[PDB]
């Protein structure tokens, strides 16, 4: 723990008054500020501006964005299995042996998949041993890449590492080791970073306009004309055509040419990056109704049914998908309890539709019809007393 | 399932069964006894079940300082080390620099002799007490001197000290450890004591030895040069103690204060021996454990074992007998009613037992309630001292027969022995052990066991030596234990012979000759 | 799928197969042994298979210090450094500041003299024991010096010492490291002794020996001037030991307490030797390893070999034979029953073996159980001492021969030998070995192997030297080893004559001349 | 694309292409070879390609200290420190504090003196080995002393020493660096040895020299006042070595131990030299790297280049020839089949190579499978030494002729030479060289190349000097190297004539006069 303390008092002498005040604020309120940094971006922008913990969040986040490192590191931590989409226990605190079948099922749940890390978190740099806090058998051993936030900071006679994780991790492999007589899972993982904007949306708008100022020039008149029909009112008709299985039941060649033009226009300029985007979804996209008992997430068994029904499955959207780069709550979808957090790899068809002037849309990305989303994580938060879900999904070929 | 201490082992697995395999506790069910494994008991009311700085689990897993001997794997014993200091050659010089009248003599060191120096034997041993009572107790720390290479010559002759001023002394010293623990940062303070008067205290500091003293190893390893006291510098003497070396007295040595460190493995790498002290555990082990010394003629062993006080039902601690405590503290193989080492037989009719006055009184109090008439089925309590003196010669008319001189009239066609057979007699029995293997200026005690299936069959014995002695013994139906003592003289003496004459019906068993101490030399 | 220790090796691989390539550990399948890839073994109970402060895979991968000898990359071979001191020439001067009388004598230093001095020789060797014993065992830490530039003259003539006042002794010393480990913070304490009398001790501290002493080189780098004892400054001497040195005895030097640190990698960048020490591992590694010494006439090595403890099935540690252990600890090319170094061939019928008494007892116990009756196919045990002496001359009527003269009446055209060819005899065999090729005043053993399928075809041999002799050896059906010893004088003497005659049927092989010790010359 | 070490360079770009440009690595296509980037090849298993305290990225990108010579930009050459002491003047003074008698003598220093002193020069060269075998190999650590103003005069006949008390010796020293490493905490030690006898040890401490010693310069900045042995006080001598200094022997001053540090770039600003030193990277370098020395007659250089051991297929280290190793060690411009320094050509025919027994034997053994029979086409191995000496005078019958005199009968109009043109021999070819521009009391060697397109043509070469000689030469169709030595004498002698007479058909080329060592003077 020598290097963590050394860099802790190296950073601490260049931390100013409000930064250090936010540092003791995280020292006394680590869990609450951590969960707030996890779930703050889904509230209203004015809820953010009036939030008491938002000042601490932005001070700590700026400190994380200014204390960087030039080389990748390996760090060890213990985190709940519920945080990494494993909704069961492998071995308990009194249990010390892990059988082959539970190792196999944990392997097949963690295989070939990505898991998000968001918010503030305190992490030790070295492998915990005899007397260190080992609450779970899941020892995550992560390779943080270059230019990633890294804060050694001393609390009383101990030292920890505050970071603002905003990245997904790909667990390359796991092993079963014996520490203090107990079977622990040591997980070698790789950080996969994503272009996520959360609440800062003006600069995301600038990026989309810079990447898509010439997009309307690249489209054919059929494709550009059908897109212009689409955002100005034809989205309702085209989505009603596609959702009701139009080309199969009662095929409309005009609407078939319309959706072909929309797909071609989305295919003209692929997105040059992997993105994290927020779509405000309703119950009908999940085969449910507003009056259905499962929509009321204020009770926990509805969330359990949501986990049992939708986690590990593929969500099919036969219509074009409208997504918003801003996670901020809006008056249009305040009542909706589903905010789908979608990850999109490189080269996918689509467009940032707000680059075209004259549209009153708010930072919208269009996605091709018939898409398949892989459900990965479902967190929860409290918009007031209304319990809402955070469905972190992705785009899969 | 239920846990009390800072240990992983359950309460049921801390009692009447203890098996620790692949760092996992399991109950002993007695099907893996012959596969080299052993069962323990450790306390379920304290993490440190013994006085050592090691809990039961780390001391039973093998997870401790590996320089500690394997005899401390059981949780019963504590890692208690002892520094003893001995001397070999004394040189007397009359200068403060080095020229002068210098005389050099070789002298043998006796570790465990003063504990059994004031012991008296009896012709018949009453009741079931087959031991001897001592008047004082001494550990392996003290070390006595016996001068051997000394022809007829006064010590003042070699120095020519006339009226007022005698010479200076200088010695060759060596350091030994008799204990199952290593110390590194040695701070040995010793005192060169003269029959109640102290000449000098020697501090060997840190540079003369170093930060390494392995358990059971002399500071010069096997055969090298002794460490001279020429590397707090010189020790004087007057013309009052110079003449007291001559007649009866032997100069002794006693270490007083010793401190050190014990190696503790860290979380990742190497053992830390800097931030430590062997001073917070001296009263931790000394006040709770017992003391057992075993004196082999080649080496000495000292052990401390945790026991039970009988007048306290609150303290839930393991209960130990005598023989089980010896087997646990030393490591022994269990033959049919027999406890064996790799070559050393230990039994109530095979070794000499020395007890202090209070412990002998306790045992005589406890020997009444036993219905088996044995000395090893005695419960162990806090605050005893045990001396087990292995005889230098012992026969039992069995597989063990190590006598360099053959007997006479040997009849082994019998079966009414204490173990194996009993020696049938027809007439005399002659033994003639030569001076080539008797150490001069010593005292030897021959003890034996007899049976006699006749009303008034009696025997005579003659110990023909420099001080010969005749004796008349009346054996009984059961096993009677008898002990006789004799001395010897220098190399120019004749062989020592033992003649025993019975009448053809008495039976002899377990005949052992042992050495006790040194006699003063006329000089 | 399963691993145990603080290491990356799987538990299933770690027994009976071990290969490291491109920093991955793969099993051994006996297919790439000729591409420089070799198998090892590792203990799956601890992260440190050896007693080193390094793990087994990391020390078997090369990701550590390169100054260590590369045959120590085997995880079963641990790093063990030894500091030795060697005197080169002696100067005696009568002034403490430096006029007066100053004499100088030229000496040569040898490493294995006291161990060999306790070894006796015999004409024939009974049963499978084809070695001898040493009286006391010592390593190459102590050394013995022999003066070549000393004709007949006493030291008193050039010093003029009458009654008590003597001169001052100065010596030229060098420091060498014969082991597979370095040390940096060298603080050696060395006693200068003569038959027990410790003359003085010297600390070289830091300013004279340097902040490094790499393995494979002494303190002067190849040929430079040796260190003089003028920079703790001088040591005194008296007129009671000079004639002792003059008659038979010699000055020996040995170090006692040596300080030093070991190198290791840091987290990211450089390497640090500040928080390390070669002082807390000695008691760990000597109590867990055996000891092997090899003494070629040019250079010597000594390594510590961990073995398998026999009387514990729980301790799952691999077992070793003798020759496999020697090959892995030193590095020797393995031809068909052949272990060859870069130049020195080592076998059982090519070198000399020195044991102590305990090794002889244990090897006579374990050697009877072998059905092949060979010395090397015996399972190795903990803490056991072996020494190998390379003969200065060895011939076998085969590819190897390093003799000063050419053997007479040689008939190599044979196949009935232990190693291919053997010398068929039809007549006398002669050699005339000169004093131009031999050091003065030494003790030598010529050994050989005689074989004849005939009854009593007796052989006589005459060794004409300064101690000339004749001997007779009868042949046997077995392959019988004979060893003879002799002495010489200063190099102005004639050729040594070796004459031997049988009866033209007997066969001889493996004729080796080796040195043992220095005879005490008369002066 | 795949990266292993902790550097920006991927492993695919760590072999066969390595472009450091604007602090990024990109791939060669052989287009910007004249735009200023030399060949870098680095280990893709080792981040530290060499034993230097740097990764391969930092040393190949300029992100290190400015005082390091830029020749260590290539990752195969390690920045290895060499510190040498130069001798300028000697004074003999009979006092100890500083009236008295004092003489002063001027002394030249020779760096590569003892390395080439054991070079035995034969008249005919075997196979393609155009190099000789030195007996001993020595680097530029030691320095040799030569007296120039050695008029006929005993050193004692003016100093007036009668029996026992000899005078004292003072001198001035300079501290240079021949290598690519700056020393900051310069604390060395050196021995002043006359013909084996050590006189004294000298340490310059820290404040007397300063906090920096750059590569390639001395503490006296070029021509300034030398630092004497006054500001560890004065060096005595006895009445046994003055005749040795006078008659045949010379004072050697050898640097024994070098202690120093370096300054590395921190994250913020300039170098930091507190927590790092030159203490452990020496053995890392010399155990993996060879040693290549250049001695141009103005100044010398030494470099350590990492090499390959053949018995290691996992060792993916770069492999080079001799000439490629020389070019990367020193830096040379490559034209068509030839390499050049700023003014010094480099070839196996222009500058001469010296190897010890191991390197010469390895080059002889490795030349058997080659078909070109050239020196520089030998693969670089570890543990081998190259000493390249540059001739003090060389002509090639071409654009280069540094001979101060003009030859006789030079016929440049020819084309069948190794390089350019050659002299068509017609009759006598003569040159004279004055004694003024040749160093007195030294040994010179003249070497050259001959061809004869006939059967048995012959040349005679007469060297008229103070040992004038005539040598016979029988050339053949193949190219013959001829090399003859002679000794120089004082300035007041005649000139030296080099004459050669042939039949008028042979061809001569590449004539080189070199100084090798200094001859002792009778005094
Ligand atoms: Ca318990
Ligand atoms: Ca317990
Ligand atoms: Ca019996
Ligand atoms: Ca393992
Ligand atoms: Ca291991
Ligand atoms: Ca042979
Ligand atoms: Ca790479
Ligand atoms: Ca690299
Ligand atoms: Ca030519």
């Amino acid at each position: 723990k020598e290097w963590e303390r050394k860099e802790a008092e190296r950073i601490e002498q260049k931390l100013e008054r409000s930064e250090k005040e936010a540092l003791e604020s995280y020292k006394k309120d680590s869990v609450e500020i951590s969960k707030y940094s996890q779930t703050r971006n889904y509230f209203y922008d004015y809820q953010i501006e009036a939030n008491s913990r938002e000042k601490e969040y932005k001070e700590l986040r700026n400190a994380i964005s200014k204390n960087k490192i030039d080389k990748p590191m390996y760090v060890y931590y213990f985190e709940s299995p519920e945080k990494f989409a494993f909704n069961k226990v492998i071995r308990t605190e009194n249990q010390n042996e892990i059988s082959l079948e539970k190792f196999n099922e944990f392997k097949e749940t963690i295989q070939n998949k990505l898991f998000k890390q968001d918010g503030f978190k305190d992490i030790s740099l070295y492998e915990p041993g005899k007397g260190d806090e080992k609450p779970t058998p899941l020892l995550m051993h992560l390779k943080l890449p270059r230019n990633t936030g890294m804060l050694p900071y001393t609390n009383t006679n101990n030292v920890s590492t505050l970071i603002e994780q905003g990245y997904s991790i790909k667990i390359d492999k796991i092993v079963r080791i014996v520490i203090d007589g107990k079977h622990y899972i040591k997980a070698e993982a790789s950080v996969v970073s994503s272009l996520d904007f959360k609440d800062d949306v003006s600069k995301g708008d600038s990026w989309g306009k810079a990447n898509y100022n010439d997009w309307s020039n690249k489209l054919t008149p059929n494709e550009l004309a059908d897109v212009n029909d689409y955002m100005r009112g034809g989205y309702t008709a085209i989505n009603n055509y596609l959702i009701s299985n139009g080309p199969v039941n009662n095929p409309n060649p005009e609407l078939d040419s319309k959706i072909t033009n929309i797909e071609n226009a989305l295919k003209r300029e692929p997105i040059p990056t992997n993105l994290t985007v927020y779509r405000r979804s309703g119950p009908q996209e999940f085969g449910l109704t507003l009056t259905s008992p499962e929509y009321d997430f204020n009770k926990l068994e509805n969330i359990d049914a949501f986990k049992s029904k939708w986690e590990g499955q593929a969500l099919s959207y036969p219509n074009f998908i409208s997504t918003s780069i801003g996670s901020v709550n809006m008056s249009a979808f305040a009542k909706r309890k589903i905010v789908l957090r979608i990850t999109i790899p490189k080269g996918s068809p689509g467009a940032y539709l707000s680059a075209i002037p004259g549209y009153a849309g708010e930072y919208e990305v269009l996605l091709n019809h018939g898409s398949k989303f892989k459900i990965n994580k479902i967190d929860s938060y409290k918009d007031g007393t209304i319990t809402k879900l955070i469905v972190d999904a992705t785009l899969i070929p | 399932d239920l846990d009390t201490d800072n240990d992983n082992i359950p309460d049921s697995y801390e009692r009447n069964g203890y098996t620790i395999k692949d760092l996992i506790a399991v109950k002993w069910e007695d099907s893996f006894a012959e596969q080299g494994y052993k069962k323990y008991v450790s306390n379920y009311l304290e993490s440190n079940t013994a006085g050592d700085p090691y809990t039961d689990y780390e001391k039973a897993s093998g997870s401790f300082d590996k320089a500690i001997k394997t005899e401390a794997r059981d949780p019963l014993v504590a890692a208690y080390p002892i520094v003893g200091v001995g001397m070999e050659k004394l040189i007397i010089s009359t200068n403060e620099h080095a020229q002068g009248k210098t005389v050099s003599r070789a002298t043998t060191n006796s570790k465990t002799e003063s504990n059994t120096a004031g012991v008296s034997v009896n012709v018949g041993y009453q009741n079931g007490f087959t031991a001897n009572v001592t008047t004082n107790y001494s550990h392996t720390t003290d070390n006595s001197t016996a001068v051997q290479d000394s022809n007829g010559e006064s010590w003042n002759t070699g120095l020519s000290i006339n009226k007022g001023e005698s010479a200076y002394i200088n010695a060759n010293v060596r350091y030994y450890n008799t204990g199952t623990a290593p110390m590194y940062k040695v701070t040995p303070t010793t005192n060169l004591v003269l029959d109640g008067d102290t000449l000098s205290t020697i501090k060997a500091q840190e540079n003369q030895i170093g930060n390494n003293l392995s358990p059971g190893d002399t500071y010069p390893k096997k055969g090298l040069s002794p460490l001279a006291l020429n590397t707090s510098r010189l020790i004087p003497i007057n013309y009052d103690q110079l003449k007291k070396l001559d007649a009866g007295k032997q100069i002794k040595l006693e270490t007083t204060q010793v401190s050190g460190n014990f190696g503790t493995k860290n979380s990742s790498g190497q053992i830390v021996t800097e931030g430590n002290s062997w001073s917070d555990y001296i009263s931790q082990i000394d006040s709770i454990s017992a003391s057992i010394i075993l004196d082999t003629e080649n080496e000495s062993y000292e052990r401390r074992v945790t026991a039970k006080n009988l007048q306290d039902p609150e303290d839930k601690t393991p209960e130990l007998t005598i023989g089980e405590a010896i087997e646990k503290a030393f490591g022994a193989t269990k033959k049919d009613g027999l406890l064996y080492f790799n070559d050393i037989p230990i039994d109530e009719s095979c070794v000499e037992l020395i007890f202090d006055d209070n412990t002998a009184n306790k045992i005589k109090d406890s020997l009444k309630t036993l219905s088996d008439k044995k000395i090893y089925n005695v419960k162990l309590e806090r605050g005893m001292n045990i001396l087990i003196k292995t005889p230098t010669y012992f026969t039992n008319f069995d597989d063990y027969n190590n006598y360099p001189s053959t007997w006479s009239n040997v009849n082994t066609t019998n079966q009414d022995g204490l173990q194996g057979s009993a020696n049938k007699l027809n007439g005399e029995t002659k033994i003639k052990i030569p001076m080539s293997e008797l150490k001069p200026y010593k005292r030897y005690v021959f003890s034996g066991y007899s049976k006699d299936p006749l009303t008034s069959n009696s025997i005579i014995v003659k110990i023909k030596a420099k001080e010969e002695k005749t004796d008349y013994l009346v054996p009984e139906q059961g096993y009677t234990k008898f002990s006789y003592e004799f001395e010897t003289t220098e190399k120019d003496s004749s062989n020592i012979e033992i003649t025993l004459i019975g009448s053809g019906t008495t039976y002899l068993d377990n005949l052992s000759i042992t050495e006790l101490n040194s006699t003063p030399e006329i000089l």
Side-chain angles (χ1 to χ4, degrees), chain B residues 43 45-55 59 75-81 262 277-290 304-307 382:
Chain B
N43 300 259
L45 292 166
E46 53 185 4
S47 80
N48 291 323
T49 185
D52 48 357
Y54 307 95
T55 193
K59 82 187 289 182
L76 277 297
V77 295
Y80 182 76
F262 50 92
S277 80
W278 266 117
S279 298
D280 215 0
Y281 293 103
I282 67 154
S283 297
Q284 178 65 43
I285 313 181
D286 205 4
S287 297
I288 199 68
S289 300
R304 307 195 55 67
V305 289
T306 314
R382 277 77 182 270

Side-chain angles (χ1 to χ4, degrees), chain B residues 402-446:
Chain B
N402 62 318
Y403 284 9
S405 290
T406 63
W407 304 272
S408 71
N409 298 111
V410 168
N411 296 335
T412 180
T413 59
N414 208 6
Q415 267 292 330
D416 57 355
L418 188 45
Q419 75 282 2
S421 292
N423 178 38
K424 280 218 173 172
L425 285 187
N426 309 135
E428 56 92 19
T429 294
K430 176 76 70 68
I431 296 99
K432 214 162 61 192
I433 177 159
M435 261 315 317
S436 66
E437 55 194 356
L438 274 296
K439 277 74 69 177
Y441 278 146
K442 299 287 96 175
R443 164 157 88 113
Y444 283 79
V445 165
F446 161 66

Side-chain angles (χ1 to χ4, degrees), chain B residues 73-374:
Chain B
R73 190 62 55 83
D74 44 350
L76 277 297
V77 295
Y80 182 76
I82 297 89
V83 164
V85 185
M87 73 291 291
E88 284 189 352
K89 165 167 292 301
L90 73 165
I91 175 168
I92 307 286
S93 169
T94 179
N95 53 2
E96 281 214 62
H97 298 89
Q99 87 287 350
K101 299 105 186 172
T102 70
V103 291
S104 162
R105 303 305 183 100
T107 309
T108 59
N109 57 340
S110 194
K111 318 200 194 287
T112 317
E113 69 93 24
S114 60
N115 174 36
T116 182
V119 68
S120 295
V121 302
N122 295 317
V123 182
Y125 286 148
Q126 197 265 338
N127 210 336
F129 196 88
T130 69
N132 295 319
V133 189
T134 192
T135 181
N136 48 356
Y137 189 49
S138 84
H139 304 266
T140 59
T141 63
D142 71 323
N143 202 349
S144 295
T145 52
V147 183
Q148 181 55 50
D149 190 23
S150 56
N151 294 318
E153 179 183 359
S154 68
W155 284 34
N156 190 77
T157 300
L159 277 297
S160 76
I161 302 306
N162 284 346
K163 184 63 176 66
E165 185 64 38
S166 294
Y168 293 99
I169 70 170
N170 202 307
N172 282 94
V173 293
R174 285 197 185 179
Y175 279 64
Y176 60 92
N177 284 345
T178 59
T180 180
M183 73 292 291
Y184 306 96
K185 304 297 181 182
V186 296
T187 51
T189 81
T190 187
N191 189 358
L192 188 153
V193 57
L194 198 148
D195 67 11
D197 269 337
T198 60
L199 295 91
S200 77
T201 80
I202 296 309
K203 179 66 167 68
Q205 53 186 352
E206 293 84 4
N207 301 319
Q208 293 164 242
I209 298 176
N211 54 348
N212 51 282
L213 275 190
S214 307
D217 289 329
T218 311
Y219 174 64
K221 186 262 167 183
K222 290 328 163 195
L224 276 298
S225 179
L227 170 71
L229 279 176
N230 272 351
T231 71
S232 179
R233 182 78 279 167
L234 291 182
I235 301 101
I237 202 168
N238 205 0
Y239 194 60
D240 274 322
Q241 313 154 89
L242 191 63
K243 300 301 291 317
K244 292 191 286 184
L245 277 296
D246 195 46
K249 181 266 290 180
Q250 52 191 24
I251 282 185
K252 292 163 69 71
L253 196 71
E254 174 64 26
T255 184
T256 298
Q257 175 58 251
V258 60
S259 73
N261 302 340
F262 50 92
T264 56
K265 198 71 138 55
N266 67 341
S267 47
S268 64
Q270 188 274 330
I271 50 163
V272 179
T273 64
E274 177 50 47
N276 219 358
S277 80
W278 266 117
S279 298
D280 215 0
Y281 293 103
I282 67 154
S283 297
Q284 178 65 43
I285 313 181
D286 205 4
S287 297
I288 199 68
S289 300
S291 173
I292 300 176
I293 310 186
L294 195 141
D295 186 275
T296 312
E297 305 315 318
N298 290 318
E299 84 272 10
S300 298
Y301 293 124
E302 273 185 339
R303 277 94 179 96
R304 307 195 55 67
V305 289
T306 314
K308 181 195 183 302
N309 62 6
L310 271 300
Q311 56 271 15
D312 191 358
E314 160 85 5
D315 169 47
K316 310 302 280 163
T317 189
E319 291 85 3
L320 288 89
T321 54
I322 301 299
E324 281 162 90
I326 294 154
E327 175 161 39
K328 213 69 191 297
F330 289 87
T333 60
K334 180 153 289 283
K335 294 288 198 299
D336 61 357
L338 291 182
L339 293 173
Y340 279 164
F341 283 159
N342 67 308
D343 53 353
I344 302 301
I346 60 170
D347 214 8
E348 67 174 358
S349 63
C350 297
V351 299
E352 193 85 22
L353 276 79
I354 305 290
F355 294 137
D356 212 357
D357 49 64
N358 191 280
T359 71
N361 286 4
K362 181 267 290 180
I363 290 169
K364 273 193 216 145
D365 211 334
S366 75
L367 272 178
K368 294 192 295 294
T369 177
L370 276 296
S371 69
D372 206 4
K373 205 187 170 71
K374 297 188 95 197

Side-chain angles (χ1 to χ4, degrees), chain B residues 2-5 7-11 13-14 42-44 56:
Chain B
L2 274 297
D3 199 66
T4 65
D5 296 332
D7 44 3
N8 50 0
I9 290 176
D11 184 75
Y13 289 165
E14 293 288 2
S42 69
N43 300 259
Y44 48 85
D56 52 356

Side-chain angles (χ1 to χ4, degrees), chain A residues 182-196:
Chain A
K182 316 193 175 201
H183 269 169
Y184 290 83
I185 296 91
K186 185 176 168 163
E188 324 301 316
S190 56
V191 163
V192 182
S193 62
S194 173
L195 195 56
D196 195 17

Side-chain angles (χ1 to χ4, degrees), chain A residues 282-297 302 306 309-310 335 337-338:
Chain A
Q284 184 62 255
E285 305 172 46
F286 295 84
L288 302 178
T289 69
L290 285 169
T291 61
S292 292
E294 300 97 356
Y295 203 60
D296 187 23
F297 295 131
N302 289 348
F306 209 89
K309 184 183 175 184
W310 290 110
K335 207 257 185 186
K337 301 188 186 180
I338 312 170

